[PDB]
Amino acid sequence: DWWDIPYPSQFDVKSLKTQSFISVKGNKFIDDKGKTFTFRGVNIADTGKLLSRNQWQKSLFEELANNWGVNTIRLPIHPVSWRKLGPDVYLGHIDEAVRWANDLGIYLILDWHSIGYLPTEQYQHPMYDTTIKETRDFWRRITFRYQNVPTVAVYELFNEPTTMGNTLGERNWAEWKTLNESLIDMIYASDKTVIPLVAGFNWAYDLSPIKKAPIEREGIAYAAHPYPQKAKPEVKNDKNFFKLWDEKWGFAADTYPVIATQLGWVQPDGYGAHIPVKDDGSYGPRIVKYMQKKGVSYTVWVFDPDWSPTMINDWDFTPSEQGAFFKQVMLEAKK
Amino acid sequence: DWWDIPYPSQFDVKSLKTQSFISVKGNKFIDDKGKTFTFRGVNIADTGKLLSRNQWQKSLFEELANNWGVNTIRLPIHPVSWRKLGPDVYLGHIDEAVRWANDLGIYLILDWHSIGYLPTEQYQHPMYDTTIKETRDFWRRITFRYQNVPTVAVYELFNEPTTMGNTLGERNWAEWKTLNESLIDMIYASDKTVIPLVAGFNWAYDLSPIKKAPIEREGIAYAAHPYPQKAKPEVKNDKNFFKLWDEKWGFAADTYPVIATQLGWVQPDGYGAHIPVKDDGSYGPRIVKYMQKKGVSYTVWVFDPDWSPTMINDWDFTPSEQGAFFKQVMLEAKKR
Amino acid sequence: SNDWWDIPYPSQFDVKSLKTQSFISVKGNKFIDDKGKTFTFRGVNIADTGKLLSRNQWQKSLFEELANNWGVNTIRLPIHPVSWRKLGPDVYLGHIDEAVRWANDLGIYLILDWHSIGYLPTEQYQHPMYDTTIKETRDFWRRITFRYQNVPTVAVYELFNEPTTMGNTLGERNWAEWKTLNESLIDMIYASDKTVIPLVAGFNWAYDLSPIKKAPIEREGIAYAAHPYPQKAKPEVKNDKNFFKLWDEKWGFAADTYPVIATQLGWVQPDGYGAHIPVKDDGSYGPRIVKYMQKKGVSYTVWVFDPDWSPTMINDWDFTPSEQGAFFKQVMLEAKK
Numbered sequence A: 001d002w003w004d005i006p007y008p009s010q011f012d013v014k015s016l017k018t019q020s021f022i023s024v025k026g027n028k029f030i031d032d033k034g035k036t037f038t039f040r041g042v043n044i045a046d047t048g049k050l051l052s053r054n055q056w057q058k059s060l061f062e063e064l065a066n067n068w069g070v071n072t073i074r075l076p077i078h079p080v081s082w083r084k085l086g087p088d089v090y091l092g093h094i095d096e097a098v099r100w101a102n103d104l105g106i107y108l109i110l111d112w113h114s115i116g117y118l119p120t121e122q123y124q125h126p127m128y129d130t131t132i133k134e135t136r137d138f139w140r141r142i143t144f145r146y147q148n149v150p151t152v153a154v155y156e157l158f159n160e161p162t163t164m165g166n167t168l169g170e171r172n173w174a175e176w177k178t179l180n181e182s183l184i185d186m187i188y189a190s191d192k193t194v195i196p197l198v199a200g201f202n203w204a205y206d207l208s209p210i211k212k213a214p215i216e217r218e219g220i221a222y223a224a225h226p227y228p229q230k231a232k233p234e235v236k237n238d239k240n241f242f243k244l245w246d247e248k249w250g251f252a253a254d255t256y257p258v259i260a261t262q263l264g265w266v267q268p269d270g271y272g273a274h275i276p277v278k279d280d281g282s283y284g285p286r287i288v289k290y291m292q293k294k295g296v297s298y299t300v301w302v303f304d305p306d307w308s309p310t311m312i313n314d315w316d317f318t319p320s321e322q323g324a325f326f327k328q329v330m331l332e333a334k335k
Numbered sequence B: 001d002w003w004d005i006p007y008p009s010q011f012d013v014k015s016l017k018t019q020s021f022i023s024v025k026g027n028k029f030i031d032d033k034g035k036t037f038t039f040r041g042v043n044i045a046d047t048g049k050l051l052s053r054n055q056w057q058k059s060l061f062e063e064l065a066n067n068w069g070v071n072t073i074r075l076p077i078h079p080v081s082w083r084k085l086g087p088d089v090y091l092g093h094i095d096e097a098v099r100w101a102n103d104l105g106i107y108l109i110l111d112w113h114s115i116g117y118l119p120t121e122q123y124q125h126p127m128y129d130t131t132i133k134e135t136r137d138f139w140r141r142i143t144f145r146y147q148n149v150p151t152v153a154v155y156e157l158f159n160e161p162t163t164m165g166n167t168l169g170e171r172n173w174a175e176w177k178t179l180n181e182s183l184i185d186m187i188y189a190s191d192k193t194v195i196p197l198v199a200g201f202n203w204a205y206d207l208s209p210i211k212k213a214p215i216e217r218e219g220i221a222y223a224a225h226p227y228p229q230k231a232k233p234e235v236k237n238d239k240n241f242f243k244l245w246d247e248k249w250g251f252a253a254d255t256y257p258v259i260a261t262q263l264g265w266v267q268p269d270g271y272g273a274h275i276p277v278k279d280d281g282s283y284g285p286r287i288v289k290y291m292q293k294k295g296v297s298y299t300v301w302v303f304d305p306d307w308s309p310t311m312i313n314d315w316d317f318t319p320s321e322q323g324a325f326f327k328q329v330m331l332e333a334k335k336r
Numbered sequence C: 001s002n003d004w005w006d007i008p009y010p011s012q013f014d015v016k017s018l019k020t021q022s023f024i025s026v027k028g029n030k031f032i033d034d035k036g037k038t039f040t041f042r043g044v045n046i047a048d049t050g051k052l053l054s055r056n057q058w059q060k061s062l063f064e065e066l067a068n069n070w071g072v073n074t075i076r077l078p079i080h081p082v083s084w085r086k087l088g089p090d091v092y093l094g095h096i097d098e099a100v101r102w103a104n105d106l107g108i109y110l111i112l113d114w115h116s117i118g119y120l121p122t123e124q125y126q127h128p129m130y131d132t133t134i135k136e137t138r139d140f141w142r143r144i145t146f147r148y149q150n151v152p153t154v155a156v157y158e159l160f161n162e163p164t165t166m167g168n169t170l171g172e173r174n175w176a177e178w179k180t181l182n183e184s185l186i187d188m189i190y191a192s193d194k195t196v197i198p199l200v201a202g203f204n205w206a207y208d209l210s211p212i213k214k215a216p217i218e219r220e221g222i223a224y225a226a227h228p229y230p231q232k233a234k235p236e237v238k239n240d241k242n243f244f245k246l247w248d249e250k251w252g253f254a255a256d257t258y259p260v261i262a263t264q265l266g267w268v269q270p271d272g273y274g275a276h277i278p279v280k281d282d283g284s285y286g287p288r289i290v291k292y293m294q295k296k297g298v299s300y301t302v303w304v305f306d307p308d309w310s311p312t313m314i315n316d317w318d319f320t321p322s323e324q325g326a327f328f329k330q331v332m333l334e335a336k337k
Ligand SMILES: OC[C@H]1O[C@@H](O[C@@H]2[C@@H](O)[C@H](O[C@H]3[C@H](O)[C@@H](O)[C@H](O)O[C@@H]3CO)O[C@H](CO)[C@H]2O)[C@H](O)[C@@H](O)[C@@H]1O
Pocket: A115, A159, A160, A203, A262, A271, A272, A274, A277, A301, A306, A307, A308, A309, C005, C006, C007
C-alpha cells in the first residue's frame, strides 16, 4: 500500500574510514589541513552498464587506485539508467562505490550525465532525457543520502549543456545561471560541505559567460570539457591552442577551481572515433601541460573498453594509446 | 479506440435534496439566509485507503453525522491514489460521498492532499508527488463535475505548502500567491459559487505573508494547520500560545474566513507520536478556546484507526484520547 | 541490444529517393514555387495515421484517389498526441515517411499538424486525445524537422492546431504568452531547417488572428491558420456582405499581409451525420467561403476526408461524396484546371 512506503535513510557515516573533506578556497581545492588539492582520475561507465556485464565491483576501483594513479573516479549517472534501475537500487549501488572509494582513500564526482538544454528539456539522445523535476529530485535524493560524506566530493549538476546550434532551444546564460543557482540552493540547504560543479555551453566547453556573469554563490567549481577538436585553429600548435583554450575556459582557473571532467582522444581512424575526440596524439602532452601550469583538476574519459574514446581496450585493462599516456601522467603525479 | 473516448459529464444536481450553499461574506461563512456558518468536523482517510478495506460506505458518514456532531467531512485526496484508481473511478467515488453527505445535510471539503513545493514540483514523500499540470487538471475536472453542487463547499487547493527548510526549493510567497491565483481563475471561470481555500508555508501554518500580500481574489478562505508544537513558547500557557498563534495565522480571521483543516494531538509517549503533534493534552482545550473566540472553522486530523494522530482505535469507532475530546466539543457545539 | 547505450541516433529522410518537386516558400503575403509563381494549397485533411491503420485504411490508394480524382495538391495530416504516444515516435515517423513518398510520387504536398486543442502554456486541453506538454511538443517538432530536412514535399509545420482556453477554464488566454511560445518553437525549427513554413494560429480555436496587427510573430516566412467553420461568425442577418465582413475582421485581413491557410473548414446539415456547433449549415456557406477565399487568395484544406470523423467529405471508403464533399470536389477540380 502506498501509505506504507517508507521515508528515505541517510548513508551511515560511521561506516567510513577517516578521509578529509575537500573544500573550495578562492581558485583552489584544499584539504582539511589547508593544503592545495587536485582531483586526478578517470570516468568509468554508468553503473547499470557495468552491472549488465558483471563489471561493477570493487576490483575495478582497486585497479584504478593501485595501478593507474587515480585519486578520483567520476560516475556518469545516465538518466535513462537512473530510471531503469530505479532510484532506490541505483542509490544502493552508489553506496557500494562510496564504501569502495573510501576504503582506498579516493574521491567520487557524481555527475548527472545528460547532454542538452535543461530549461527546454530537450536533449542530444533519449539516454540523456530528463526534466527539471527529475533533475531536482535526483539532487534532492543524493544530497540527503550523502550528507556529511567526505568521499563524495563534487556534485556535477548537469554534464554537458548544449542547444546543438539552438535546435534544442535558445541558449541563454541568464536562464541557465538561474537554474544552476536554484539547484545549488537545494543542495546547500541540505549539505554545505559539498562542491557543486557548474558547466557552460558548447558541451561544457565555453565558460566565457562567467567573465561578466559568474554564478553568484560561493564554494563552487567550474567544469570544462576540452576535447581536442573543440578549438579549431588552422595551424595546430601549442600557442594557438593555448590562446583558444584561454579565451573559452582556461581563464576561469585564475579565479575559481576548474575540473576538466572530460577530456581525451582517439586517432581519427581508431575505435569510436568521432568529432570532437579525434587527434593524432599531440593533444595529450599539450592538454596535460596546460592543465599542470594552471593547476586544473581532471578526469579522463573513459575507463571502459566499449565507450569511446577508451582508456583500455579490454577488461584485462590493456591500455589504449590515450590510456597508456594518461596512466604514466597520473602515476608520476601520484609519486 | 482513443477517438471514441467520451467527453466528461457533470454531476446531476437534481439527484440532491435541498441544501444551502455556503458563501463568504467578509470574514465569515454564511448560509443562504445570511446566518453565520462554521465548518466543524473531521478528516477521513483517502478514498482508496478506505476502499481497500471495504470501509468506503455511507455508514461511515452516518456515524460521524449522527454520533460525532460533524457538519463537515474533509476528503484528503492523495495524488498517488488519484493516479492509482484513475480520475474516472475516483470521481465516481467522490460522487457517492456527495450523495451521502447531501442526504445527511453535511458538507465536504475536497483537499488536494500534497505536502511540498508545487512551483518546483518537489515533495515530502512520493505519495504526495504531483505536477502543476496534474494539479490544474484535478481542479479543472472537479470544477466541471461539481458545478452548482452546494454539498461540495470548499476547494482546498494544496494541503501543505512547505520547502522543508528550502531543501525542496526556495520558498517564495509571490510565486505561490500567483499560482494560487491562476488556479482560482480556472475555477471561477467554471463555478463562482465554490470557496477556494489557500494555504501558507511551514506546512500551512504561516499565513503572515497575507498581511502585506493577500491573494487578490474575493470569496476565498485561508487554511491553518495549528498543530501543538508549531508554536514553541519557552513558557507554555494561553497567553504565549495565543500571541504566537495570533502572529502567524489567527490574525487572518479578523479579515477572512479561516478553516483549521488539520489539527490534533497524541500524547508524547504515545505509540506513533511525532513532532509536531505531541502534547500532554492541554492543547485541546487551548486550541478550541482560541478558535471559538475567533469563530474559526475546523476539521480534526484524522478519523481513522491507522493514520495518526488517530481519533478512533478501530472501526467500531472506539475514541482515542483526542477523539473523545473532540467528540464532546463537536457534540456540544452542535447543540449551541 | 535491449541495452539503452546501443540505441541508435536518429536518421534523416533519404532526399535522393524523391522525384523532383518544387519547394514552396513564403514571399510577402503569398506562397510561391521555385519559378516564383504564386502557389495555393488546396486540399483536404485525412484522419490521424493511427486511426486509419487500425482498419487498414492507411494506404497509398487514399492519396491516389485524392490527387487523381479530387483535384487536391495538399493533404493535411492531423497528428494526434495520444496517437503519437500509442504508436510511438519511431513507428509514427516511419508512417509519415510513407506519406512523404506517396505524396511526392503524386506531386502533392503535406501539411503536418500537431493536432491538439487547448492551451499549451498551462498544458490543459479540450480532451485527453489532445493531451500534450511543452516538452513533448518541442520534441515532436525537433524530431520532425530533423527527419524531413531539405524535403520539398513536406511544406508546412502547423505548430498547434487549435489554441483555446474554453472560456478561460483552461488558463488565462494571453497573446503575449502565446506569441512568445510560438516564437520559441519557430526558433528550434529554423535552427534545423530554415526552408519550412511554420503555420501559427490564434485563439477561439484558431479563429482570431486580430492580435497580429500590432503584435505579429517576429519572424520571417510565417503563415497564419484560420478555421472558419460556418457558425464561428454569427451575423444577425445571413447574407454574403455580413459573413464576408465578419470573416475579414477576425482572420481574413491577415491575408493582405501574410499567407493564410484555412486548415479546417466545412459543414454538415444541421440534422446530418455527426452534426454539432460550429459546423452546422444549410449549404449556403460553401459558396460563400469559397468566394471569399478565392477573392483573398487564401489556401485551404477541408475537414475531413474520412467517413467516420465529421463533418465528413465521404460516406464510405468507396469515396461516395457527402454534400460538402461533392461541393468541394467540384471547386478543387475546377481550380486545378
Ligand atoms: O552506440 C554508439 C557508439 O557508442 C560509443 O560510446 C559512447 C561514448 O562515445 C559516449 O561518450 C561521450 C560522452 O557521453 C559525452 O558526454 C561527450 O560529449 O562525448 C563523449 C565521447 O563521445 O558516451 C556514450 C554514453 O553516454 C557512449 O554510448 C561506443 O564507443 C561506440 O562503439 C558505439 O558505436
